[PDB]
Amino acid sequence: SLKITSIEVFDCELKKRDQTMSSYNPVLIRVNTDSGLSGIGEVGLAYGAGAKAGVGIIRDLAPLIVGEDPLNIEKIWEFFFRKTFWGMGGGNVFYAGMSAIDIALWDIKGKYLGVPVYQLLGGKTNEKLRTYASQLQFGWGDKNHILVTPEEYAEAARAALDDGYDAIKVDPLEIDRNGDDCVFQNRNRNYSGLLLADQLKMGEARIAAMREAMGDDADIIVEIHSLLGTNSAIQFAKAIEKYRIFLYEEPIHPLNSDNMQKVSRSTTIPIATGERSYTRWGYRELLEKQSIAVAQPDLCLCGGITEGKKICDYANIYDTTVQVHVCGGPVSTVAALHMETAIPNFIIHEHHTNAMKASIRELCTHDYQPENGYYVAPEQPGLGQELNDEVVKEYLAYVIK
Amino acid sequence: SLKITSIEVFDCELKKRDQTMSSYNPVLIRVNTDSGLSGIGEVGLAYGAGAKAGVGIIRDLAPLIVGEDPLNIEKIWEFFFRKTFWGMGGGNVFYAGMSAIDIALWDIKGKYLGVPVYQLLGGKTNEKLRTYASQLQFGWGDKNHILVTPEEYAEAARAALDDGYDAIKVDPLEIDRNGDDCVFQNRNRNYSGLLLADQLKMGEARIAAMREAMGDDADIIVEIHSLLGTNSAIQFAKAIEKYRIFLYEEPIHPLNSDNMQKVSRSTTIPIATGERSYTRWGYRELLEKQSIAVAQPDLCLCGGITEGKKICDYANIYDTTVQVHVCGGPVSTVAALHMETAIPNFIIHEHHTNAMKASIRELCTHDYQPENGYYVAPEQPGLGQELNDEVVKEYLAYVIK
Amino acid sequence: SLKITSIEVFDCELKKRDQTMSSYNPVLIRVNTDSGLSGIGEVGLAYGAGAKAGVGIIRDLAPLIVGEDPLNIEKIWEFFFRKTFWGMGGGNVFYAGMSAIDIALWDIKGKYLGVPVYQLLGGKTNEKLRTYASQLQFGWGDKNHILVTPEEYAEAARAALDDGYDAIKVDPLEIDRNGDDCVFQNRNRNYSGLLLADQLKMGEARIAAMREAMGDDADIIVEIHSLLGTNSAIQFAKAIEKYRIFLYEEPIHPLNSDNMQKVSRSTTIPIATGERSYTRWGYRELLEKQSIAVAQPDLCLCGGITEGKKICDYANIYDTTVQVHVCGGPVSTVAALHMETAIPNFIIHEHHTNAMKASIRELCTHDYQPENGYYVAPEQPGLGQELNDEVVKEYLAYVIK
Amino acid sequence: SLKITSIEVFDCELKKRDQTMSSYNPVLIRVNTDSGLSGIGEVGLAYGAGAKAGVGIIRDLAPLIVGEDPLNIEKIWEFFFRKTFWGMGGGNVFYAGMSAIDIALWDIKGKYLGVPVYQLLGGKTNEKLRTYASQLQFGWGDKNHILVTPEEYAEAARAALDDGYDAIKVDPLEIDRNGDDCVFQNRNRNYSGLLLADQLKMGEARIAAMREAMGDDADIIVEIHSLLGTNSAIQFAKAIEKYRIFLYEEPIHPLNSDNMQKVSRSTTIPIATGERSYTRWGYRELLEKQSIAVAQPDLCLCGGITEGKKICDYANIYDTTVQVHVCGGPVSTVAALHMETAIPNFIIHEHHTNAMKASIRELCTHDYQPENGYYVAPEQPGLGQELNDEVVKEYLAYVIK
Ligand SMILES: [Mg+2]
Numbered sequence A, B, C, D: 001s002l003k004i005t006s007i008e009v010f011d012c013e014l015k016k017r018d019q020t021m022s023s024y025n026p027v028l029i030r031v032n033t034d035s036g037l038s039g040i041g042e043v044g045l046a047y048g049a050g051a052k053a054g055v056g057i058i059r060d061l062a063p064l065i066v067g068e069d070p071l072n073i074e075k076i077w078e079f080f081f082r083k084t085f086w087g088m089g090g091g092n093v094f095y096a097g098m099s100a101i102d103i104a105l106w107d108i109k110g111k112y113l114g115v116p117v118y119q120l121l122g123g124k125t126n127e128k129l130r131t132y133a134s135q136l137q138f139g140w141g142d143k144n145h146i147l148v149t150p151e152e153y154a155e156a157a158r159a160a161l162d163d164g165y166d167a168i169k170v171d172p173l174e175i176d177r178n179g180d181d182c183v184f185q186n187r188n189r190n191y192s193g194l195l196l197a198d199q200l201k202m203g204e205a206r207i208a209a210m211r212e213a214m215g216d217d218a219d220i221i222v223e224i225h226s227l228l229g230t231n232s233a234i235q236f237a238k239a240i241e242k243y244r245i246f247l248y249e250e251p252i253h254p255l256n257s258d259n260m261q262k263v264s265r266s267t268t269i270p271i272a273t274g275e276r277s278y279t280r281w282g283y284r285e286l287l288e289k290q291s292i293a294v295a296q297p298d299l300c301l302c303g304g305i306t307e308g309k310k311i312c313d314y315a316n317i318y319d320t321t322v323q324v325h326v327c328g329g330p331v332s333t334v335a336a337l338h339m340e341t342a343i344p345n346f347i348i349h350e351h352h353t354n355a356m357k358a359s360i361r362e363l364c365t366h367d368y369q370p371e372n373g374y375y376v377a378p379e380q381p382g383l384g385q386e387l388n389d390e391v392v393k394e395y396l397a398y399v400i401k
């Protein structure tokens, strides 16, 4: 049999190699065994305020499974859920720690059994995966900058379509009229109540310009990053329904599920959420209340592959399809690709604007990128990724033995 | 006006000074200002899997408020909620980081204004605070060890009453037949479904013996630590109803609020929970579904004094009274005392079996202990504690400047 | 320590100095202590039928706290709630009496601690406060008269915008086709059922003329003063949705919360209410039923600053923002300014058309007015207002000793 | 036709004529007409904090109907509801002012038409009215003082039965161990959460002793005066169910109707409330949620005879029967008797322990007292009372002409 021998934690402070990417700190792990099979995982706190907590949570959780059999993945998941105290009252950090370990264990099991992770998740259901260009308020391809003017948003939409995408996502309210970023800066605090005329006009004009540039057929997902409250989310939705919006993502935060239901009932645009929703239990009220068209769990936050699969299976009975949230290192991308290949209720894959950055790509050994708007799964045993040790040795923070 | 100059984070690995306390690791902070006024706070992850994540979250949050005016407490809270990404989909670790900072800010403001924190929370509403002896499964007073036999539990109860308490709390199922601890060990996995006869008998016998030793008048709170599921929680409740139980704490975890409601409707014992429920949003479904008689936020987890007050005020409209959850360092205790002194809907104060332990006491410079089953408020400016520098220098982990 | 020594009640029958303002009777109080620190408050019954009851309620409540420590503000509030009989079945008059006393106690506590009241409410969250010109059916600035013709309403909108406002409020149905006032006269009794064509046309034409005059960007709040019933409120709302209405205030009275929900579900205009809703308990059904976008408690009716803060905190979890209702003397204005400065869910401040009247301004020592559409908080200890004794000595009605 | 010429308001400070009755201050009015017909009414704020507000509200409302035709009772009621501002967000004081006027108008109309008021309410439905001896915690008959010991309560019960009653009401928790009164004093603040063992025992012992002294057949109503909260109300109910309790009155206050429902569902004792519930709107949630077996509007608070009748008629469709709340002057009694004589859903009449007191009796010119546990209706035109001018001249406070 196998025993876990050590877990390495990498604090990937990208600013050390790429000062461009200073808002960014992937947290990667490697779980090693006495057989010599290792697996890699990722804690999904690469952006916002969380990376150092993410490193910490691996230090908290890793000691509990040193010496244990990695193949009992359900048992290990349940132990973390039940026997840690915080497993039964956890959130983004705790479940991110479980997720990272869980991903690595799936990687190990695939290598042990000689097959890609999608085989272990039910086989090749989807041979290729429709993909969108994500977060175009930061540009696409050539012109990468913070976009303010409607013409700039139109240009980014054209760039993405020229790159062979037939779907894009944009947050048209994140960037204020001065070019400040409302996700991370105290700007437009009124967003949580009702929009001002200028703000409604700013957001609608960006979407209008993008729809004009793209034509009618390509799809537009409107990302809101939980910036709006129930009333402004509905207000803005009604202003943009005329542009044929595919999905309306995180119109408000997920903490009040009844408010999510009210948003969904009050616009014709289908609602997506999930990146800030963790475990089956974090989807129960969203699904039961018929509030969402699309679930977007992050496999590096929601409980990993074991739990992600369960969220997908559950979503299916409410006609809710799945786009895994992906915004971190290469490990998140491969976990998503295996999940999406296997699940019958896949809808679309998210290709983040920064997924081609050198400092992200160099963390791992393989590069999986879309071609002409489509992704395919890795075919090697396990996830099909390893860490690039030449780079990650500089990011090694802790070894749990 | 004032400016935050640095935040110190203390990783209190108590095992370094007391090998008996290796299950515990308080996480303390100190927020310093350019006036020389400092405030102290606590991240409520002293037990279970979480301490190192708690250290990390302070590394993540502290840099965002270095240089800012500490007096703008509501603004700082809201910024953490809104502009960090994870504040709108947090959990135990994120909200614990917010809590510690918030508590340190109230300490600063009390010191600045020259009054105890209870004055800033509305004044001296409750002159003294009824207190219970908490967690008697580990003994009380003279005989402190893991208790197994009904007679041992009866002895603990007598010891508590002799110490001047007229209320105790006990988890009569945590310890199995062999003395193993179900909270942190993989024992009695069947607890989440239905109890076996031996287990029902084991728990009831402990309660029965305790009630016999105490007499009818002293109160028994039954703690379940979310060890049971809906069905076993009800099964066990109905077996112990005959002993006149004051509160039933965490019969199940709080992740499914409808199941909490079902428990509440299926026993005559009033339900308490809340140590694993964070922010006002954490209490909305519990209160609206009329599921709980007593809310138990931990001020070092639930969002601090600012948010804890709001939880208390909200609970009041549903006739839900409050016992702050306290299991950590001396900072958690004083935050609790100030809150409980101010709120009209205080019910009882939790005095944990280890809150008198040297290795916990020695973190801070003052003593606050109950007398004749009652607590009173600190009366000095601010929280009424400082760090004991001679001790905590050995625990200093990071300074954010 | 401090003890309350006396409470003065001022029956401000403005007609004694200003026959123009004969519909108006502010009720002010002053609470004095043995330290020489005094605080002022206001009973929010300056208009409609209530002022003499308001004077009476201070006579009823004041004796109960002579000799008591004013710093225990929560204790005093709770005593009035619990131990007066009518505190637990009260309404506008009883809660107005509690509010006035509560405001004065906050004033005292701010002076005692040397800081403005907003500091005690959580600090400076909002540095400036967007303000609307309120009740333009009575004119703005130059032409103050009862407005009937659509051109007159357009003129008042222009006057307000010229005064530097970017938002206005108007009740376009209060004034009937003969210039009578439906709020206080038995006219258009059919309003509670369904509107007649002429009435629908009258109201819509006024709003249309105002939107035309203002342009598209400035905001229009439509005040209904509970004149309409569920069916006519919806009927009228649907007629005016085309003009981009910001808020629809008091479309019906608050006594049937399910009817409020039905109104909210049946129009795209966000609903505001609250001036006739008192205490947390008066908002529970409004919020739970997701009926309101904006809460408008009057701090001189709803339970004061202590309770107002609690209403704001509660509203926030439903994405409900707050505009304090202000239509009385200068004390109401300052209480609102301190509240709005501190709360994270402020949306807009109400500047009533009569807030510049000489006979109102002369009641107090300071004048706080908006500049270019914005208010700021007072900065002196306490509320930042005192009574102007030269004037108010003529209004002194009772001293409770 | 007739015209109202003046309204006299009497501030009945009974302490001026009887120092034993200093807790009580009836507020009476007389409405005079140009025909010489007068009517009398009562503002139901004779106890608790409210009398002077009640005098004031008559000053506020009276001027609005001087000169009007008193026969248009529905019109006058509706005008107060609709055209005063506060009538659509009132409460105890506002609706009490409406009530007093309304009762005086029915007195006038009965006199004008030459028939007792019950005839105008539908006729003599109930020839006699079962009556209970109310509030035995203050003694009955020979021994009138604050009662403490179970034997004292048993003695009160025997005294009532000897007086010909076959039903009593008692609040067994209002008086503490030391004889202090929890209704108006800050004692037993914990009552709003959960009862302590001593308090549960104290209340149960009083009920037990009473049931023993009475025998099984006579009825016991348990009054709680809204002293308990949801959880303690249920706790105490379940302790006294064994004594066969007829009604449980005001187990909690009426501000949260969902909690009232929860109480109703959690005990086998039928719930009564309504003295602190006003207008039909005050009863809607109570009746629809099937929370109450018996409604207890006070006609001097709930909106008078006009509105009281409507409450009775509405309660009927939910099988809710009516006991009018009566604790005030002789006017409240006769209004009750006429209402109860007419309504098909009468259940029992409340005879308060002080309704026979000289200082209350002497306010009016006639005697109406129960006999052998039964009341009958007055038979003279109108209400069947006049003011005793020789007494009330000393209480005259205002005349509105
Ligand atoms: Mg997103």
Ligand SMILES: [Mg+2]
Pocket (backbone or CB within 6 Å): B223, B225, B249, B250, B275
């Ligand atoms: Mg616990």
Ligand SMILES: [Mg+2]
Pocket (backbone or CB within 6 Å): C223, C225, C249, C250, C275
């Ligand atoms: Mg209004």
Ligand SMILES: [Mg+2]
Pocket (backbone or CB within 6 Å): D223, D225, D249, D250, D275
């Ligand atoms: Mg009663």
